[PDB]
């Protein structure tokens, strides 16, 4: 089945929504769904109805990442717990999610992956600032698709980005170079300990960025400064990257195809900002260190044959 018609399902109510937090259930219930607990939902058996699962609790992200190719419904999931799992969150989240255009969104996607495919590098000019990603031969990306797969995953928010990835290696498919100044950032982490050792300094830098004056400049595909409320953080973040992963290294750089309503501001750590129009560039896997997506949500975007 479709994404397009996955939405279209969610918005009609058409579907349930698996939810592992009861407060996070009866909010889903307010707005007119059917909830199934996450350790009740039959995730075994074939089926060809669709269902949403979101994840508030950082202790079930493992059992999500267990469902790949093992799952025998077709699924998208909204995996708070790895962002912001407070209430707040999911009611801005589910009411972002019910409200994006996703047919237009999906046609953009599309339109930006043939793009992204067909060039040799991408400007990203956001304020003064220009950012450079050099595309190689092979392009890696996480989905380009828009159908849902048999046992695969993904979250709501793929659909409504179109991004390359440097998964192999530390420029398998694109390096970047320039300055990106930025609205705000988001922040992934696939555990509570990296959760814990980080949460602490990027909710800080969170809070700051709410002032502006945020500037990422990336030298040979590492950040090389990091500005942010106005105030250079570069040495913050470099120690605790110190050694971890690929260090400041880009590993993620996409394009937002949404529409922006019900939009939520920058400061708030939400899974969906990447989607509101605009261009992010993303160090670390959420491994040892979070997946940091600096996003320009009012970025313009030119491809380079």
Not at 57 to 60: A, P, R, S
Not at 257 to 261: L, M, S, W
Not at 271 to 277: D, I, M, Y
Not at 285 to 288: E, F, N, T
């Given at each position: 089945m479709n994404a397009s018609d996955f939405y279209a399902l969610l918005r009609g109510r058409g579907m349930p929504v698996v939810v592992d937090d009861a407060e996070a259930a009866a909010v889903v219930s307010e707005l007119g769904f059917r909830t199934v607990p996450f350790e009740a939902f039959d995730f075994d058996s074939p089926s060809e109805d669709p269902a949403l699962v979101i994840v508030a609790?950082?202790?079930?992200v493992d059992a999500l990442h267990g469902l790949?190719?093992?799952?025998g419904t077709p699924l998208m999931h909204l995996a708070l717990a790895k962002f912001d799992g407070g209430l707040s969150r999911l009611r801005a989240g589910l009411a972002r999610v019910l409200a994006v255009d996703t047919d237009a969104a999906l046609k953009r996607r599309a339109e930006a992956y043939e793009q992204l495919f067909s060039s040799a590098s991408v400007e990203i000019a956001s304020g003064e600032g220009v950012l450079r990603c050099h595309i190689g031969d092979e392009v890696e990306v996480g989905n380009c698709g828009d159908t849902l797969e048999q046992g695969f995953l993904y979250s709501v928010a793929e659909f409504l980005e179109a991004s390359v990835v440097n998964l192999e290696g530390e420029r398998s498919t694109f390096w970047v170079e320039g300055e990106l100044p930025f609205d705000g950032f988001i922040h992934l982490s696939n555990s509570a300990a990296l959760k814990e050792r980080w949460g602490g300094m990027l909710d800080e830098f969170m809070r700051r960025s709410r002032e502006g004056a945020n500037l990422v400049r990336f030298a040979d595909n590492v950040i090389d400064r990091l500005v942010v409320g106005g105030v250079d953080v570069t040495s913050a973040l470099a120690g605790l990257s110190?050694?971890?992963?690929?260090?400041?290294?880009?590993?993620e750089f996409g394009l937002g195809?949404?529409?922006?309503?019900a939009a939520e501001p920058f400061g708030v750590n939400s899974?969906?900002?990447?989607?509101?129009?605009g261009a992010y560039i993303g160090i670390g896997?959420?491994?040892?260190i979070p997946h940091i997506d600096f996003i320009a949500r009012g970025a313009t975007i030119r491809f380079i044959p």
């Open positions: 609790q950082m202790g079930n790949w190719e093992r799952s110190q050694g971890e992963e690929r260090g400041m290294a880009a590993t195809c949404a529409d922006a309503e899974l969906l900002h990447k989607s509101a129009g896997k959420g491994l040892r």
